[PDB]
Amino acid sequence: EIDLNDPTATIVIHPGSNSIKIGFPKDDHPVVVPNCVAVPKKWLDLENSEHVENVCLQREQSEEFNNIKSEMEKNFRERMRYYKRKVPGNAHEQVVSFNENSKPEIISEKNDPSPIEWIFDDSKLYYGSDALRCVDEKFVIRKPFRGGSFNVKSPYYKSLAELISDVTKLLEHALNSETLNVKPTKFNQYKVVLVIPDIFKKSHVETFIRVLLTELQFQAVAIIQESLATCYGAGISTSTCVVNIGAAETRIACVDEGTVLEHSAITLDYGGDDITRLFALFLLQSDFPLQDWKIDSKHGWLLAERLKKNFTTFQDADVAVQLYNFMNRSPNQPTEKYEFKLFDEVMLAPLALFFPQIFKLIRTSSHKNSSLEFQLPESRDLFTNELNDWNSLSQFESKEGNLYCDLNDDLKILNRILDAHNIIDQLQDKPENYGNTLKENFAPLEKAIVQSIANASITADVTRMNSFYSNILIVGGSSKIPALDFILTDRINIWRPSLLSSASFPQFYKKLTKEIKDLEGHYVNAPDKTEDENKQILQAQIKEKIVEELEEQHQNIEHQNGNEHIFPVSIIPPPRDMNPALIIWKGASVLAQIKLVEELFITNSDWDVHGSRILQYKCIFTY
């Protein structure tokens, strides 16, 4: 009952697209619970909204898809030349695919599982790992979460109420488990630390708090943004850039001295899930023995996920015409082992992180519920009525394809950089249906990270550039690809412009801003000419010129009569045998254990008197 700030009585929760991470803070590890609910097909209206799409895929693809895969094949060739080896290649044996029946002795393939003890009773809903064994001829799977937020675009939900009921029943199922055995009538003894994305949607956050306190009846809730949690989960002192690779999205953001820098945040619309889809396709195109792959069905998706997780690498050392195998488990058959050869598909697929346009080519365009979305309006300031979610300069640039890495001269780069504070100003109160609504962000990973880091510095404290480039942490369930650190490092280094590689940029940039400020400032009287409406351009052309002057002065100062100072690119995953999917939960559980959270727990009484308005006063980030 009673409300003390003691960690024993705290549950730390980190929703994600693949699985919700949950446990007590002092746990070595949290329970990992699949983000899945299995619904008997006979319970749902499935005619008009239709797309029984759980049943179809496509080995052949467009030219553009062919072109891009050809170019990926080049990039691969070059990497392999640049270190090691090639061969005769594609010429094959999977054409003549041999399957081998297994006695029911499915010794483990990998991880925590072995054979599948299926669920045939379609007279109830199932949750988590239970949902994962429901036979898909009887059940459909919905997923309450899209990585932190509520999965509004799912078409299996007719309303928030529906969505929330399986959020709460999914949370309950998790909370009731061999290792945490907390039933719903005891929820009011617990407080919750909730992990929330960096660019959270206020209506989701607020709804979730409302749900945890008002319906699940938790004592109190405290929230934290993914990137800060990931810093707590590793080491927070420094300035650092977090790259989080998830199933559906990749999130990048910088963190400096306790805060997640708004204009550094980028949400990229691709992640481990497109790698998985790419991999399946590539396997199909290299004549994979299972040719009709029902990829959006549970059974086939699971198969696609297993293989890619088992097999995809950036490790050039290990890329060889190889024999791989797998067992295809049997909805109503004997278990069939298959053996297949792979060569380059294991790297081409994740290489797509840098040619993400191909991801776009192979998935259907979003089909969000406006019946559901209409019930989660985007947050608006109660006074001005203006969209008031965090809204990041870097998201807007990268989405629109204005990436610094794609600019050639230094002047354009410098000017755009110089323009930033206007671009953010325009952003925060435009005739703003501008900053594309439906548009997905398909910017290549490496260019995105550079964007994030450049803006992360110039919008706040530029002198942290160095520190950012030497603490890029890679984290997230889909980031567990060997040698991702390695190739990412190559690529930032090829792509980062030279202007933005010089370790003295911040110092230069800092000088230029001051000297521009001495043109608006120490000329506070109306410019020299008699008449002035354009006479601000004779100081806007003197600005144009001083830029060129200092820009050039820097370059002559660049020769430096010898050796050149240059930002590193330290990309740092967690050690082999740590799980990158769990840093965040770890970090949250560290918050959960310290003096700080005490001040940050929104309690029920907090919430009934004040509503979402407490977030303005109890929150580790400026809400």
UniProtKB/Swiss-Prot annotation:
Coiled-coil residue windows: none
Compartment(s) of residence: Nucleus; Cytoplasm, Cytoskeleton
Gene Ontology molecular function: any one? mRNA binding
Principal localisation:
nucleus
* Chain sites annotated for binding ATP: 244-247
Q: Its GO CC terms?
A: cytoplasm; cytoskeleton; Ino80 complex; nucleus
Please give the biological process terms from Gene Ontology that the record holds: chromatin remodeling; DNA damage response; DNA repair; double-strand break repair; mitotic recombination; regulation of DNA-templated transcription
Look up keyword Signal and say if it applies: no
Q: Which family does it belong to?
A: Belongs to the actin family.
Protein name (record): Actin-like protein ARP8
Whose protein is this, by species? Saccharomyces cerevisiae (strain ATCC 204508 / S288c)
Residues shown, of full length: 259 to 881 of 881
